[PDB]
C-alpha cells in the first residue's frame, strides 16, 4: 500500500511539473516530441498530434523533449530560435506549477476542515503543572486562569501559543504575566523559553479522565479495560483528570492497583500489577487517553490566505535549511530520498487522508525548491545557462556546452548514489 502510494505521489508530482512545462512551452510556439513520465523503456505510449504521450518503466524521474532545443535549427517552432527571456520562462514553468499546485492543495485542505484538538479552543485553565518546571518554579498553582501575557491579551490556548512563539522569535527573556485565581490579578515575571527549539512552559490543560485506547497484550488488556470507557478512582483515590491518572500510575511504581471503574454504569474493582516493565524498568499499563478534537472548516478566502502565508513560512524554512546545508551547518544525511519519502508515504497511509494531502503538498514544495538550486542538468541549471547567454549576448561554446552537460550528468549521478546510500543507512536504523 505504501509503495504504490509513493508511486502515485511521485507520478502525480512529475505529471504536474511536466504538464506545467508543457503548457508554458505551448504558450510560446514550440513543438513537443517526447513526454516521458519516468525513465526506462516506455511501458505504454499513445499518440495525439505532436503529443507522443508515454509512460516508461522506471518512475524515478521524468523527461520532456522539444523541437530544436539546442540544435542549429532555424524553424520558427525551434526552442533555440526563441529569445533568452522566453527560454528562461520555459525553464521556470515547471517549479512554478509545482508551487501553485502546493498552494492550491493547501487551500483546499484548509477549506475542507482539520480535526484541531479541542483543548485549543477553550479559555486557558491550568489543570496540571509539570513537577519542578518553570510554571511550578514561579508558583503557578494548578486550576488557575492566565489572563494576560506580556502585552498580547490572551483568551484561549491558541492565543497563548502564538504569543509565546512571537516572544521567542523577538528574543525577549523576561515577561510580565497577569494571572487570575479566585479573582486576584497577580503580577509575576516569567522567563521566555525558546519554544522555537521545542521546550515548553510546562502547562497542562484540563483533560477528562477517560480512556480512549488500550495496548493489545497489555496487563490492562488482559484484565479487560476496553477503549472508550471511564474510570472514577484508583484504589479509592478520587481523580478528576487523566493527568491525575498519569501521576497515580507514576507514583505506583509497581504496587497492586485496584481501579474502581464505571463500566458504562456499573462499578468494577479491577486488580492490576503495573510493575517495572523490563523494556524500561518502569510502570507498564499499555493504556491510552481519549483524545477529543473538533473539526474546523475555513471559508475559501481565509483558507487561501492561510495557505499563502503557511507556504511562505515553510518555503523560507526550506531556504534556511538549504543555506545551512550548503554551508555545512547540517549534515547531508537529513535529506529525503525516494525510500525515505516512500516510508513517510506509508506512514501517512496508516495515518489518514488529511495526512495524504499535507505530506503530498510538502514533498511537492520540497521538489519544487530542489528544482531551483543552481546545478547542471537540473531545472535550476538551464536558467543559469540562459541568463549567462543573455547577459553575454552570445551562445555558449559547443565544446563548453558538452563539457557542461557531461559534468552535470556526472555530479547528478554521484548525488543519486549518495542519497541511495543515505536511504540505506536510514533503513538500517
Amino acid at each position: 500500500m505504501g509503495l504504490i502510494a509513493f508511486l502515485i505521489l511521485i507520478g502525480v508530482l512529475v505529471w504536474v511539473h511536466e504538464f506545467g512545462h508543457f503548457l508554458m512551452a505551448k504558450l510560446f510556439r514550440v513543438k513537443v516530441e517526447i513526454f516521458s513520465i519516468g525513465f526506462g523503456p516506455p511501458i505504454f505510449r499513445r499518440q495525439w498530434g505532436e503529443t507522443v504521450y508515454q509512460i516508461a518503466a522506471l518512475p524515478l524521474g521524468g523527461y520532456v523533449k522539444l523541437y530544436g532545443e539546442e540544435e542549429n535549427v532555424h524553424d520558427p517552432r525551434a526552442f533555440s530560435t526563441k529569445k533568452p527571456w522566453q527560454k528562461i520562462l520555459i525553464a521556470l514553468g515547471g517549479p512554478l506549477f509545482n508551487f501553485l499546485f502546493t498552494i492550491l492543495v493547501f487551500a483546499l485542505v484548509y477549506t475542507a476542515g482539520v480535526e484541531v484538538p479541542k483543548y485549543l479552543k477553550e479559555p486557558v485553565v491550568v489543570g496540571y503543572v509539570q513537577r519542578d518546571s518553570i510554571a511550578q518554579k514561579i508558583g503557578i498553582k494548578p486550576g488557575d486562569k492566565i489572563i494576560k501575557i506580556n502585552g498580547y491579551e490572551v483568551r484561549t490556548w491558541e492565543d497563548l501559543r502564538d504569543a509565546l512563539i512571537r516572544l521567542s522569535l523577538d528574543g525577549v527573556k523576561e515577561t510580565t504575566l497577569f494571572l487570575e485565581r479566585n479573582g486576584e490579578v497577580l503580577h509575576l515575571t516569567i522567563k521566555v523559553p525558546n519554544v522555537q527549539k521545542g521546550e515548553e512552559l510546562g502547562i497542562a490543560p484540563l483533560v477528562k479522565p477517560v480512556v480512549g485506547g488500550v495496548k493489545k497484550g497489555s496487563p490492562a488488556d488482559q484484565v479487560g479495560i476496553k477503549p472508550g470507557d471511564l474510570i472514577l478512582e484508583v484504589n479509592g483515590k478520587k481523580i478528576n483528570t487523566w493527568y491525575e491518572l498519569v501521576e497515580e500510575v507514576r507514583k505506583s511504581q509497581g504496587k497492586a492497583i485496584k481501579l474502581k471503574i464505571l463500566r458504562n454504569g456499573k462499578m468494577i474493582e479491577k486488580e492490576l500489577i503495573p510493575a517495572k516493565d523490563p523494556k524500561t524498568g518502569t510502570y507498564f499499563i499499555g493504556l491510552f487517553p481519549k483524545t477529543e478534537t473538533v473539526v474546523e472548516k475555513k471559508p475559501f478566502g481565509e483558507a487561501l490566505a492561510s495557505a499563502v502565508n503557511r507556504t511562505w513560512e515553510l518555503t523560507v524554512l526550506t531556504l534556511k535549511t538549504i543555506a545551512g546545508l550548503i554551508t555545512g551547518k547540517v549534515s547531508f544525511q537529513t535529506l529525503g530520498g525516494p525510500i525515505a519519502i516512500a516510508q513517510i508515504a506509508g506512514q501517512a497511509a496508516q495515518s489518514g487522508f488529511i495526512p495524504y494531502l499535507v505530506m503530498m503538498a510538502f514533498i511537492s514544495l520540497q521538489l519544487g525548491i530542489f528544482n531551483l538550486i543552481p546545478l547542471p542538468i537540473l531545472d535550476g541549471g538551464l536558467i543559469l545557462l540562459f541568463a549567462i547567454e543573455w547577459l553575454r549576448g552570445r551562445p555558449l561554446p559547443e565544446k563548453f556546452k558538452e563539457y557542461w552537460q557531461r559534468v552535470g550528468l556526472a555530479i547528478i549521478i554521484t548525488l543519486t548514489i549518495f542519497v541511495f546510500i543515505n536511504d540505506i543507512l536510514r533503513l538500517l536504523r
Partner: antibody
Amino acid sequence: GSEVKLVESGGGLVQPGGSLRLSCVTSGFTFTDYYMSWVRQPPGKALEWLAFIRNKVNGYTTEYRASVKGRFTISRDSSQSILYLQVNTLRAEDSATYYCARDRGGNGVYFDYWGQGTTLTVSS
Amino acid sequence: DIVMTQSHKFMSTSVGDRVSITCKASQDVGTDVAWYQQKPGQSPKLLIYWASIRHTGVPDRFTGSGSGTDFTLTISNVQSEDLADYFCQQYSSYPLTFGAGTKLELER
C-alpha cells in the same frame, strides 16, 4: 547591578565523627527566588549532587539524595541571603570540595552559576 | 539510579579541530541533560541545556545534539581556551547524577 556571586566558608580540617556547618553567602540576585544546592566534588571523582531547596512559593521544601537523607541538612537563613549546610557523623569519605550553586529557572533543575567552593578534609 | 557513563577518560585533539565527546545514559532521560566545563582550580560553567540549547554568552563553536541515550557535545574549531574538563548531567529523575568528566589532551 552586581553580577551573581557566591562565596562559601566553613571548610578545613575536621576529625572523624564530628559535626560542622558550611555557609554560602550570595549576592547580585534575589536570594529567595532561586533553588540552592550543595553539590560536592571529591578529588579525582565525579560530581555528586547532595540536596536542593525550592523557592518561597513552593514552601522552601527540600530534596535529598537517598544515601544522605537523615545525615545532611540544607537550610536558608530567615532574614539574610545565607545558605547553610549542617553535617554530622563525618567520615574520611566526606573529604571533598563542596560547591554552593545557583540554578536557572528553566525546565528541570540545572545549575547556572557555581561558587569557588570550599575544601573539607576529614581525617584523624 | 540513573548512571551517566562517559566511555572515554581522555580525548586527544589539536587547536582548530573538531571534537565529539559522547555521553551515555543508563536509561531513557529524553532531553533533560545539561553540560558543564571545568578548568583547573575553577568552578564548572554551563554551556548547553536541554541537549542542544546554548547558554547566553557561549560561543557558537559549542554545539550539543542527541536524543535518548547517546548524547554528544561537538566542538567545532577547537580553540586554545577550550583545554578543560567537560562532563554531562541528567535531571530527568532524582537523584541528579553527573558524568565522570572528560579531559582534553593536545596532540603533538
